[PDB]
Design a protein that fits this description.
This is part of a larger assembly, with chains A and B. By secondary structure, chain A is an all-alpha fold. Chain A has helices at about 1-5, 10-45. The N and C termini of chain A lie far apart (about 95 Å). By secondary structure, chain B is mostly helical. Chain B has helices at about 30-55, 80-115, 120-125, 125-140, 150-175. The longest helix of chain B is centred in the middle third of the chain and has 36 residues, at about 80-115. The chains are: A mainly alpha, B mainly alpha. At the A-B interface, helix 2 of A face helix 2 of B. The structure holds the ligand CCCCCCCCCCCCCCCCC[C@@H](O)O[C@H](CO[C@H](O)CCCCCCCCCCCCCCC)COP(=O)(O)OCC[N+](C)(C)C. Ligand PLX binds near residues 5, 6 and 7 of chain A. Chain A: It is found in: Mitochondrion inner membrane. Chain A: Complex I is composed of 45 different subunits. Chain A: This is NADH dehydrogenase [ubiquinone] 1 beta subcomplex subunit 5, mitochondrial.
Chain lengths: ~70, ~180
């Protein structure tokens, strides 16, 4: 009676644990991957991250400048 | 009684001597056990008959749960957590079953010692060898894993023992 009215079967807890373990394992591997990706982008600068501004080339004036040699 | 298996818990045939009274003087044990039967065994049996028939009016059953076999820790990839969980649970169930096997053999040993009386040293050698074998196997499997034991630690211990055995056998063959 106690088992019937207060508790559930073992399969429920077993499969809930399986799902929880999957979630945590993927989170751990994602954390490692993100750390490595951040390190690579900060070192190489070719990624979307750690992009530091440079001078906009639309500011340059391309006209004759009173002297032939610029 | 049918409540347990006679093979898992064996007993000898239990030979009992017959009373051979050398005198006509009345002993107290037989008369006293007769009045004990009359005063205790009979009403207790009546109450049990009533309780058993009340139980028989309402008969219902329960079942022993069956667990199938799952791949063990040796077949699990290095970080695959789902198979590791399944293997760990299976290993824990097997560990408890092994504990219960050791308990059964120890019960056999204790019963033999009590039963054989003054002849227990000679007449309980079979149970002593059974317990020696089972204890050796259990100690090989689980002795030094400690708290925070796991299937991986048990596998590592087995692998270490197997390397030692293989090295010894190769030395013996080449000696
Ligand atoms: C002879 C009797 C022997 C057994 C004695 C039993 C004693 C029962 C009281 C002790 C209870 C222990 C604590 C249990 C708390 C948790 C229980 C909880 O899990 O059950 C919930 C229900 O909780 C109960 O309603 C709590 C009962 C609280 C009262 C207990 C008895 C004492 C109450 C005293 C009140 C006095 C008030 C003033 C009177 C004048 C519903 O659970 P749920 O998550 O769905 O479960 C899912 C699985 N299902 C679907 C199979 C169930």
């Amino acid at each position: 009676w106690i088992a019937r009215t207060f508790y559930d079967g073992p399969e429920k807890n077993y499969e809930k644990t399986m799902a929880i373990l999957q979630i945590e394992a993927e989170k751990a591997e994602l954390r490692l991957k993100e750390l490595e990706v951040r390190r690579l982008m900060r070192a190489r600068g070719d990624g979307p991250w750690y992009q530091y501004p440079t001078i906009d080339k639309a500011l340059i004036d391309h006209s004759p400048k009173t002297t032939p040699d610029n | 009684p049918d409540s347990w298996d006679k093979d898992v818990y064996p007993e000898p045939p239990r030979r009992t001597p017959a009373p051979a009274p050398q005198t006509s003087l009345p002993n107290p044990v037989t008369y006293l056990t007769k009045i004990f039967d009359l005063l205790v065994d009979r009403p207790v049996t009546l109450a049990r008959e009533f309780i058993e028939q009340q139980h028989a009016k309402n008969r219902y059953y329960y079942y022993h749960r069956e667990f199938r076999r799952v791949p063990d820790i040796t077949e699990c990839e290095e970080k695959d957590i789902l198979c590791m969980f399944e293997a760990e649970m299976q290993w824990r169930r097997d560990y408890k079953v092994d504990q219960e096997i050791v308990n059964i053999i120890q019960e056999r040993l204790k019963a033999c010692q009590q039963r054989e009386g003054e002849s227990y040293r000679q007449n309980c050698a079979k149970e002593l060898e059974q317990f020696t074998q089972v204890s050796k196997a259990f100690q090989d499997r689980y002795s030094d894993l400690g708290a925070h034991y796991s299937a991986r630690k048990c596998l590592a211990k087995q692998k270490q023992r197997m390397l030692a055995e293989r090295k010894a056998a190769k030395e013996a063959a080449a000696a």
